[PDB]
Amino acid sequence: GYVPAVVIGTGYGAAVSALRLGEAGVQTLMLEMGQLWNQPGPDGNIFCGMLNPDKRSSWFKNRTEAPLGSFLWLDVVNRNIDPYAGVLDRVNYDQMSVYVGRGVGGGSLVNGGMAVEPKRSYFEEILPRVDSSEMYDRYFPRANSMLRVNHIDTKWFEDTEWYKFARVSREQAGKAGLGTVFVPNVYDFGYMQREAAGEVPKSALATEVIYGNNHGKQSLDKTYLAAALGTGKVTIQTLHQVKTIRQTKDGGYALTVEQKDTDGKLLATKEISCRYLFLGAGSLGSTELLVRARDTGTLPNLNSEVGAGWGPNGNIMTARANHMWNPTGAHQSSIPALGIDAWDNSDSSVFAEIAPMPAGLETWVSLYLAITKNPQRGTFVYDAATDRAKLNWTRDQNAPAVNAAKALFDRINKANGTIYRYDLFGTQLKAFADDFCYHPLGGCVLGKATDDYGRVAGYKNLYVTDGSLIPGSVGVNPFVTITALAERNVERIIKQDV
Ligand SMILES: Cc1cc2nc3c(=O)[nH]c(=O)nc-3n(C[C@H](O)[C@H](O)[C@H](O)COP(=O)(O)OP(=O)(O)OC[C@H]3O[C@@H](n4cnc5c(N)ncnc54)[C@H](O)[C@@H]3O)c2cc1C
């Protein structure tokens, strides 16, 4: 049937859009391909942890996989599984694996919660057509407030065993003249302090994050989406995957949608139409829908920028072997609290997450997710044979990201007399993981595939709201930027179009 507004997906862009539509009185249907994560599993918990993965961990895989960096210790717990509508997907392109969340809340279910604003100078470089004053004065503050961003108690951080890993890297970075910053988070740090005191059920302190947090993490289902549902104008249909979009004869949109069960079986195919269509299917999902629509002729007016300008936010993972006298601890909070800030907007820029190691025993390893400034971009093209958008990206294109990461961590190693680990990512001498990302950005870039508010070029009442808008990089963990842009965009769209 017909609904005035449809929002595809339930991640950051989608959730912002749905809340503001509902508040404006617009009846809105969100279509999410994954599950609503609210039914207890076989252990009485919603989500599995990283030391007890099961089919809930993985979107339609036949074996669980260790969190990147932890294979040497966590492979022992990983198991064959039945393919299931689990929470974390690995999308494997030819030379890049992109991790994404699947469920009501999207990547907010599985992410590390780091809620970071980009440097304004870098924001102005990447998005010069956008008014940066409105972003920093209005929309970033709005996003942080709605997301329930909070800050760690710095005295507790200094004292607690659970952040020894972060203090070690801080000290090591300092010897090399590099500073660290505390990173705000949507995980409730007061709750985390109570976990450490044995006062509340553990989640961050029980090796949970990447397959969901059973407690503590304020994912979108608790924040924007709960508020959207509260308007009485928003519905969410789960296990509904949008396959196609077309323009209708009177200028609306019609979607073909597959309803599945949690085992992946097809239950129904539906056509849903609307006046206003908002894409929040993520960098991969929104881009794929639009590339397919363009190249199969169902949205033939889409421009050639649809599909272009993809990047992995410069993501590179690496690890250092600490001296014996600098153990990182058996007990490591699963939520990062510190980053190394070596981002000066030059091509040597690095902002590096100090990431925890979920082994549950002492490994002496420090793990880092580096975010770099690498101008290389990939492109999604349509493959009519498989009916899929394929990402054209080669591993060579991450050479500049590897080089920036390596320059920074070589500096830290030289200052401390330490070496890399080379054995964390498989059976190859490899210190830098250069073919994954957690932060896919672009494919439907703001101002190129769309106007400066995410209105898709060639069409009226058709909007993109999500990470596909961002031009490949933001220099920090991206969800705060996605949220803030979405707030800006939907405010304008509702005012001027709806
Ligand atoms: C392991 C990991 C760690 C991360 N850590 C951090 C962090 O600490 N801080 C940070 O800032 N960022 C982090 N990120 C990145 C962050 O989660 C993403 O940038 C953000 O979730 C992207 O938001 P989005 O709205 O673009 O899309 P998503 O959050 O990816 O949501 C897209 C939604 O659309 C659904 N969907 C897709 N296609 C369809 C379709 N055709 N039909 C119906 N539904 C569809 C998906 O199932 C999903 O629920 C992390 C991500 C991962 C995977």
Q: What is the largest CA-CA distance in the chain?
A: 71
Strands (E) across 379-418 are located at 379-383, 388-392
CATH classification at residue 16: 3.50.50.60
Taking the C-alpha atoms of residue 55 and residue 53, their distance in angstroms, rounded to an integer, is 7
**Is 90 in the same domain as 215?**
yes
**Is 285 in the same domain as 187?**
no
Task: Give 292 Cα–ligand 1 centroid separation in angstroms.
Answer: 20
**Is 237 in the same domain as 344?**
no
The percent of the chain in helix, strand and coil, each rounded to the nearest 5, is 30, 25, 45
**Is 40 in the same domain as 87?**
yes
Output the six-digit token pair for 446: 């703001």
**Is 420 in the same domain as 469?**
no
DSSP 161: G
12 is in an annotated binding site: yes
Q: Which atom of ligand 1 is nearest to the CA of 467?
A: 26
**Is 153 in the same domain as 143?**
no
Instruction: Look at the chain and report how many structural domains it folds into.
Output: 2
**Is 350 in the same domain as 367?**
yes
DSSP 138: I
Tell me how far CA of residue 373 lies from CA of 311, 315, 444, in angstroms: 10, 9, 20
Determine how β-strand 350-355 pairs with β-strand 234-237: unpaired
Domain around 186: 148-205+315-376+398-434
Task: Give 71 Cα–ligand 1 centroid separation in angstroms.
Answer: 23
360 is in an annotated binding site: no
Structural domain ending residue among the three candidates 417, 434, 451: 434
Q: What is the stated resolution of the deposited model, in angstroms?
A: 1.2
Taking the C-alpha atoms of residue 274 and residue 287, their distance in angstroms, rounded to an integer, is 20
Task: Give 439 Cα–ligand 1 centroid separation in angstroms.
Answer: 8
Instruction: Please state how this structure was obtained.
Output: X-ray
Residue 111 identity: N
Decide if 439 is catalytic. yes
**Is 246 in the same domain as 124?**
yes
Residues forming beta bridges with residue 420, ordered by sequence position: 320
**Is 72 in the same domain as 106?**
yes
Decide if 353 is catalytic. yes
114 is in an annotated binding site: yes
**Is 350 in the same domain as 458?**
no
